[PDB]
Amino acid sequence: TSSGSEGNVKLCSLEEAQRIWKQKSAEIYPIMDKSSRTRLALIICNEEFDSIPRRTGAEVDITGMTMLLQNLGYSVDVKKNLTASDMTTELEAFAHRPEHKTSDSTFLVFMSHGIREGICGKKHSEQVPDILQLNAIFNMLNTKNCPSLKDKPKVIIIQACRGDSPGVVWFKD
Amino acid sequence: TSSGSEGNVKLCSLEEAQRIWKQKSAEIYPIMDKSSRTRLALIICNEEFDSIPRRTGAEVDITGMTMLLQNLGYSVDVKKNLTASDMTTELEAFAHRPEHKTSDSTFLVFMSHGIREGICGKKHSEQVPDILQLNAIFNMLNTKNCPSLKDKPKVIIIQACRGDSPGVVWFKD
Amino acid sequence: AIKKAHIEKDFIAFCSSTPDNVSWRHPTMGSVFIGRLIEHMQEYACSCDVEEIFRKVRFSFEQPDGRAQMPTTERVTLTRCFYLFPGH
Amino acid sequence: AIKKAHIEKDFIAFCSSTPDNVSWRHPTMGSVFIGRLIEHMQEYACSCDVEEIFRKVRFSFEQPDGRAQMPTTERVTLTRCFYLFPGH
Numbered sequence A, B: 001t002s003s004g005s006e007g008n009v010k011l012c013s014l015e016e017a018q019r020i021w022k023q024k025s026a027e028i029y030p031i032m033d034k035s036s037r038t039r040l041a042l043i044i045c046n047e048e049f050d051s052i053p054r055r056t057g058a059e060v061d062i063t064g065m066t067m068l069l070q071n072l073g074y075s076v077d078v079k080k081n082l083t084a085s086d087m088t089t090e091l092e093a094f095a096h097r098p099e100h101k102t103s104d105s106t107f108l109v110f111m112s113h114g115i116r117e118g119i120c121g122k123k124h125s126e127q128v129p130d131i132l133q134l135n136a137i138f139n140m141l142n143t144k145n146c147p148s149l150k151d152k153p154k155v156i157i158i159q160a161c162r163g164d165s166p167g168v169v170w171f172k173d
Numbered sequence C, D: 001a002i003k004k005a006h007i008e009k010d011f012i013a014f015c016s017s018t019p020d021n022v023s024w025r026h027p028t029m030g031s032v033f034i035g036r037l038i039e040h041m042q043e044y045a046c047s048c049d050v051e052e053i054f055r056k057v058r059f060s061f062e063q064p065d066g067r068a069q070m071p072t073t074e075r076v077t078l079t080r081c082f083y084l085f086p087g088h
């Protein structure tokens, strides 16, 4: 049933969970007790921009991801329409969250316009760039700047253009 | 025995090869007939530089990789002490090699000094940079510039510093 | 006492396209990469680790149409398999 | 007739360290990442695809010493598992 907390996410059975833990050795990330763990996730989605076109359909993405990450057991923070500076501030705040200490992993989701150099903030234009670099996301969440997530999976997902090219070439058959 | 063509590389048995092809679906890269295939590999190793320190022990790396890639069935091109321009030229020549058409995959190995921006050429100094960008390696070997390796695994291996940092942080236990 | 730890470890990034290239979004259906990821997470989180799931997503994009993209896994320092164990 | 193909696909890069960080080399023993890769290729090419092998290499570096590094997989567009099938 999809009426449960995991919604449409197919469940791993105990026999399945024991088999994964058996077949492969001690090279799986440990999972914390469901009862006590405090899993956290952050979605930053820029939909309305100052200069660049409106990201129509962003609502479907936010809804889908939010529900999915909740289904997987994460408490989801959703922040919308931020400058690169605001995103950095929000990321710094996320890294300082006490729940990470009693969490086993995290998800970070960025959804916005993007260029080759990185993700576009709300105030972005070609004349006055407003860009968050992927490099900065890793730095803010690494062991130095986020000690609480040491040894824990940090999954970053980015929906954005990485340039202007269609990404295709022709060949004959 | 290590006296065979695969040397110290542990062999996949026919029962093992049939099991891998059975357990997982049609999501494995196809392997070409051993009799007719012409697998190619390129090692670029910079050991002696104009300005920066000598990469003592590079010989062990060249030997090890060369033998390994030969063991895996690749004919190995080894090019030493090249500028970023020469490396580009060599890469372009490798992409044009007819053997790729009757190959199922390739390996590219780069071994040199490196900075955050990329791999150091033989003539590199801080005053006059001589850098091959990782970006350029992908571009020269992609579908547009190397159509022969379309749909085929291209494995790039890089031994190089990516900056000056030790890559460590302290924590108390 | 103090101990050394890697500054950067246990990361995986998943981008919607390859460098230099566009990622597509439908006005009512949403972003294709996001929808495809949800679908694959929902189906495969029970049996596959995230690296495996991400590969399957890439595979689903294999046949290009008028709006083509190839999602890309980046800067991977996962030292173990990450299973979500949904339901647990 | 002509058909569309992804400009960039079926790549995997494996770097010796994480961005900003050094990679170590011994004057007589060679580069640690290279030696470790050969060892792991030799042992695991028979049973594991390259993505799996590369993860194991990362795992082998997990405990840092005075000369520490964390090898990093980059720009991955493999859509299938790449098995070397050594002996075949």
Ligand SMILES: *CC(=O)[C@H](CC(=O)O)NC(=O)CS
Pocket (backbone or CB within 6 Å): A055, A112, A113, A114, A115, A159, A160, A161, A162, C022, C023, C024, C025, C026, C031
């Ligand atoms: C190029 C872009 O940044 C966006 C990505 C997005 O998901 O909004 N793509 C487009 O605007 C083309 S639909």
Ligand SMILES: *CC(=O)[C@H](CC(=O)O)NC(=O)CS
Pocket (backbone or CB within 6 Å): B055, B112, B113, B114, B115, B159, B160, B161, B162, D022, D023, D024, D025, D026, D031
């Ligand atoms: C920083 C570097 O480029 C080199 C990498 C190499 O394999 O030569 N590392 C060192 O010089 C430190 S041993």
